[PDB]
Design a binder for this molecule. Structure first.
Ligand SMILES: O=C(CCCC[C@H]1CCSS1)NCCCO
Ligand SMILES: [Ca+2]
Ligand SMILES: [Ca+2]
Ligand SMILES: [Ca+2]
Ligand SMILES: [Zn+2]
Ligand SMILES: [Zn+2]
Length: 156
């Protein structure tokens, strides 16, 4: 778990699937989901080393977790730690979106940031930490009680 309350993120590179401002907004809204139920504060920085580096990448991309083309694995993230710790990677071979076309970035990012914070997978299909992608309306979205218990067991 992170041992401090102010956490930084940096967007290393932007998918061409989406408007720049939309990538910024989805990711910001996703960190806010977790800010809402912990003492953590998140800030985007533009240069330098962040805690959580947000990367869009395809295939082999320098870690030991290659992506697999369109479908299958959508994204992965490392738990808290220095260097690659915390970093969240999104498969560029998906088509990222604001809505239900393709793969919703916001929802995926909430799930991945959960990992960045120290959460593992849930068995509850209602939880955002369930592995299986299922679109739900991005204004209807709520963490499940399982999710809140999980993160609060780690930070609050
Ligand atoms: O784990 C992911 C990210 C998607 C996580 C699923 C949550 C967020 C999208 S809707 S609920 N890709 C590999 C899963 C595919 O088997
Ligand atoms: Ca990191
Ligand atoms: Ca994939
Ligand atoms: Ca893409
Ligand atoms: Zn990776
Ligand atoms: Zn996962």
């Amino acid at each position: 778990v992170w041992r401090k309350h102010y956490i930084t993120y940096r967007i290393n590179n932007y998918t061409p699937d989406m408007n720049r401002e939309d990538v910024d907004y989805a990711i910001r809204k996703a960190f806010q989901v977790w800010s809402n139920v912990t003492p953590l504060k998140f800030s985007k920085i533009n240069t330098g080393m962040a805690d959580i580096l947000v990367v869009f990448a395809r295939g082999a991309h320098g870690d030991d977790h290659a992506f697999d083309g369109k479908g299958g694995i959508l994204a992965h993230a490392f738990g808290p730690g220095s260097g690659i710790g915390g970093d969240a990677h999104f498969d560029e071979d998906e088509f990222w979106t604001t809505h239900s076309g393709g793969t919703n970035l916001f929802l995926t990012a909430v799930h991945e940031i959960g990992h960045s914070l120290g959460l593992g997978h849930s068995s509850d299909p209602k939880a955002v930490m369930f592995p299986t992608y299922k679109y739900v309306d991005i204004n209807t979205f709520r963490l499940s009680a399982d999710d809140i218990r999980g993160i609060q067991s780690l930070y609050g």
